[PDB]
Design a protein around this ligand. Structure first.
Ligand SMILES: N[C@@H](CC(=O)O)C(=O)NS(=O)(=O)OC[C@H]1O[C@@H](n2ccc(=O)[nH]c2=O)[C@H](O)[C@@H]1O
Ligand SMILES: N[C@@H](CC(=O)O)C(=O)NS(=O)(=O)OC[C@H]1O[C@@H](n2ccc(=O)[nH]c2=O)[C@H](O)[C@@H]1O
Lengths: 574, 580
């Protein structure tokens, strides 16, 4: 068996009197009163070792240095005074033996403070990535990686109980000139031919439905060689799943229970079911975003039809006027800050007014008095609030005041806590020629089918986004399983036969052999884990990520190769 | 919820009288006296639907052809005569409604026989791969994929319980397991490439340096080999690593894990512990470092018996290995084994016969002078054939071991069940008989035996390694080792393997630096998951347990990969194809 009797961090008062053998890293050394104190560290926490002058381990304990690997043997004793900041805080190990298994260079940054329950000073992330094997020693990084383990195991437990089959799909697959750029992999035996890394398992998981497996899932790696701004990594992890004989409601209900199971098991958090649902239109109208942050209120209100008789030209002639009531009298500085946020989102400006006990004052207050009673009933505003207005095209006015709404939450210091999931449903299928939103296999709404050719912009898709605290963490749809409907959607998009066969030939042929009704979703697992941990970047929930630029400071990739290794592939740099 | 009330194949007589809603594929249709019988198929199997001419479902049922997708509603009733070949064979569904969800054209090969319990005729594997989404409809393929799911879930259950942390490691990493790298061009700086990982070896050791203590991953490995011997461009490993372990700790945990996997996924009890043979023991007794323990016929050393023999080819040889087969082979069969032997670098194969008193055939004349000792050493009986290979010890063992394996097939020995074993105490270096050079058996991070450290400079060929292979039925299904955690020793072993300081820094500098920050003792292993699943299912190829595999030339008939890309796309990477 092993030489150690326990994880160092697992010792408690229940272990007093036992002789233990421990192995780990020297977190810190302190000399007090002629005793040598060593914080011994492993993944379960710190435990205090004490060397007394008479002990055989005394000289060894004096020479050891931070991050040295040691094996320690001694008796578990009670501390005279407990340190409540350690789970082992009531006990210590009186050393009889101490053996050095590895010395260590002074690390480029400290990794010891979190294990004592102390705040850790921010270090250069580039430094942290270059020495990531040391960065991963820190308590916070190990908790993130172990939560990610618990989340994936919980996904496995749940989906296995619900009859899902995990299926692993190819990594070396067909490159298509369709949309997002592929990472390529040269085929050595025939120069000029390339595999591609997969953008997602979409076509394979649909083909697994055509194969009759009924329900599938995979913790899938997706590779997309595009802009790496906005926290993107060159590859990321999805929870990918697909089901047969389902409606939208079936997919949402399954994913709700799975998510609630994941949060209960991996975080100890209870998520009330069902999640709230909002159509795309409702989300845009009430929050100005298709990923609403539900951790605070302050909904947008359409007040356009209140000013159709008002002399205020800019309100009267606008297609939309959105209003927002902030529960605070803003400074002129804050208003101009919100105005700049609005103008940065294509708005012509931001009108404003304070609401007093009898009327309004400031900004556009004069033009608000004739409609006072109606305006207050629509906005539910009270004396002391500030009313913000954006007038313009409907999408612009909503999106601009929605961004104002988010920035206003920070100005007001609103407490945004917990986890607020919601479904955004009934997205438009297309957008102006015409083009689809995600991928062309998304089914139109059955009752909107006749509008496909008549009024395409009004056609709803059977697609849905999962949103958590203003962040898209999941997206999916019911798929087309009728090849004639799929051809009909292609004819509407202007996508000819030669283009279909080149991009999708093998899958379109698959639909001719009896595809069941099916649909699915993929979660952004790294995004979910970052949100579950309050991390500012998905880099904090990935063991060995790339930096914001796409490179790996730890190993140096991407790096050149000997020209003989490249000549062997039949390629050269131009 | 769902329209569907049950899986089609799950109906039993306990459901008789219930009204059910079912969804699935038409396995087959036959018409009889106006009735329309549809075998409805889903992942649980077949159930018979009956459409009566008086039913509203009848008009729909008349359009239906095989592989059409339908939703059916009706009442479960007993069949007048039951079909004992089906789990639903006692019942049928009297249809009250039927709707076509999807039509289908005739598949290029049948998928229906297996769901009836009937034998499936062999289809061209290239055609099966081209229509892999239809091939995956067959019962055997779904059984394979569902078994694959059960095996991985069992691995998660066991290792999670044992405190292992699953960590996912990079796919776009730095350009080491004895193969060529698959490269990925870095678009922004032409001339820069990522490499796909041949294994997660260095990342999992760094996870030990990070203090995670025990790791696992169901990892995808990419190795650009001459894809002979059923190689796929990428394959799947159960990868794992542990800290503060000796060889025995790694072996015992894997044994218990495998026994759990087989128990939960196959219902098979594997007796523990696994047998253990050293590399030298396995090579002496079986002529192979991956012995097949499903039959006997062990190899015997008889060289010391011929030191007074007139047969110079025996008398000069370092080794003469003998094997006694319980059969009088034909001369054709002997020549076949001789050809096998010669294909494995042997100088030849000798033969004879054991008869009631004397010997007959082949080299029997030179065997007669040494009879008493030979029969005690070989345990040969009348009617047997004795075979010999003479030569250097490793050649003689390997050649007669390959003869041994072939002879098991010629003799029709019933080799059954699952016979695991560990092979341990591998030498640090392997002698390439061809290139006349020392190479490492396992990757350069394998720790030599600590007792042998002074031999690294004094006598490298005597150095043992803390490495081990897991063998199942003569197939290498796992391999691992205790690692080097001292940076001085790791450079010392790099020096031995012919890797100067310049090559060390350029390929492994980041990792040697990590060893300077207090690396713990650690070791681990990796299973060949596709290999194991192929063996668990008796499949002849790992392609039978991979959902969408490549063909033997590493190509995907289903998708057309690998394929050309637009000249514009290759231009953007700053690369061009060399003109021949
Ligand atoms: N095959 C379809 C899913 C389906 O229809 O079933 C698909 O991939 N959709 S997707 O592109 O929206 O990604 C699905 C989800 O993946 C996450 N994500 C996406 C891009 C990225 O860089 N990081 C990231 O975490 C994000 O949460 C998104 O909602
Ligand atoms: N990094 C070490 C593991 C360790 O030392 O912990 C490693 O990869 N070793 S390995 O290369 O032998 O693969 C480990 C195992 O992977 C399987 N296999 C290998 C190559 C291949 O093409 N198909 C296949 O199935 C095979 O069973 C082998 O025993």
């Amino acid at each position: 068996g092993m030489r150690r009797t326990h994880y160092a961090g697992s010792l408690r008062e229940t272990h007093v009197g036992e002789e233990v053998v421990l192995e780990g890293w020297v977190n810190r050394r302190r000399d007090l009163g002629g005793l040598i104190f060593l914080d011994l560290r492993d993944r379960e926490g710190l435990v205090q070792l004490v060397a007394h002058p008479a002990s055989p381990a005394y000289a060894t304990a004096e020479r050891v240095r931070p991050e040295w690997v040691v094996r320690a043997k001694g008796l578990v004793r009670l501390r005279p005074e407990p340190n409540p900041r350690l789970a082992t805080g009531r006990v210590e190990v009186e050393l009889s033996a101490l053996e050095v298994l590895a010395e260590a260079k002074t690390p480029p940054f400290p990794v010891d403070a979190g294990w004592r329950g102390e705040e850790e000073k921010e270090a250069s992330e580039e430094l942290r990535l270059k020495y990531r094997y040391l960065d991963l020693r820190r308590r916070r990084m190990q908790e993130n990686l172990r939560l990610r383990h618990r989340v994936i195991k919980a996904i496995w437990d749940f989906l296995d109980r619900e009859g899902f089959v995990q299926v692993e799909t190819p990594f070396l697959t067909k490159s298509t000139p369709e949309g997002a750029r592929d990472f390529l992999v040269p085929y050595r035996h025939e120069p000029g031919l390339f595999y591609a890394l997969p953008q997602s398992p979409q076509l394979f998981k649909q083909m697994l439905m055509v194969a009759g497996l009924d329900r599938y899932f995979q913790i899938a790696r997706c590779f997309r060689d595009e802009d790496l701004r906005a926290d993107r990594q060159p590859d990321f992890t999805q929870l990918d799943l697909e089901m047969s004989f389902v409606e939208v409601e079936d997919v949402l209900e399954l994913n709700e229970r799975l998510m609630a199971h994941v949060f209960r098991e991996a975080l100890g958090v209870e998520l009330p079911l069902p999640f709230p649902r909002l159509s795309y239109e409702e989300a845009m109208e009430r929050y100005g975003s298709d990923k609403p942050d539900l951790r605070f209120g302050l909904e947008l209100k359409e007040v356009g039809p209140l000013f159709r008789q008002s002399g205020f030209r800019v309100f009267q002639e606008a297609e939309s006027v959105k209003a927002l009531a902030l529960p605070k009298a803003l400074s002129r500085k804050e208003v101009a800050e919100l105005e700049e946020v609005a103008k940065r989102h294509k708005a012509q400006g931001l009108a404003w007014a304070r609401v007093e006990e009898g009327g309004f004052s400031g900004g556009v207050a004069k033009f608000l008095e004739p409609v006072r009673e109606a305006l207050l009933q629509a906005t539910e505003a009270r004396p002391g609030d500030t009313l913000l207005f954006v007038a313009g095209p409907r999408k612009v006015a909503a999106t601009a005041l929605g961004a104002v709404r988010l920035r206003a939450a920070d100005l007001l210091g609103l407490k945004r806590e917990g986890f607020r999931f919601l479904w955004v449903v009934d997205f438009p299928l297309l957008e102006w020629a015409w083009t689809y939103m995600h991928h062309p296999f998304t089914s139109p709404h059955p009752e909107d089918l006749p509008l496909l050719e008549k009024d395409p912009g009004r056609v709803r898709a059977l697609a849905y986004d999962l949103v958590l605290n203003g962040v898209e963490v999941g997206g999916g749809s019911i798929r087309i399983h009728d090849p004639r409907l799929q051809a009909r959607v292609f004819r509407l998009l202007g996508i000819g036969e030669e283009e279909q066969r080149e991009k999708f030939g093998f899958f379109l042929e698959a639909l001719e052999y009896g595809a069941p009704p099916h649909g699915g979703i993929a979660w952004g697992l790294d995004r979910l884990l970052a949100l579950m941990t309050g991390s500012p970047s998905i880099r904090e929930v990935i063991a060995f990520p790339k930096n914001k630029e796409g490179k790996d400071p730890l190993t140096g990739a991407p790096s050149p190769v000997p020209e003989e290794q490249l000549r062997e592939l039949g390629l050269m740099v131009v």
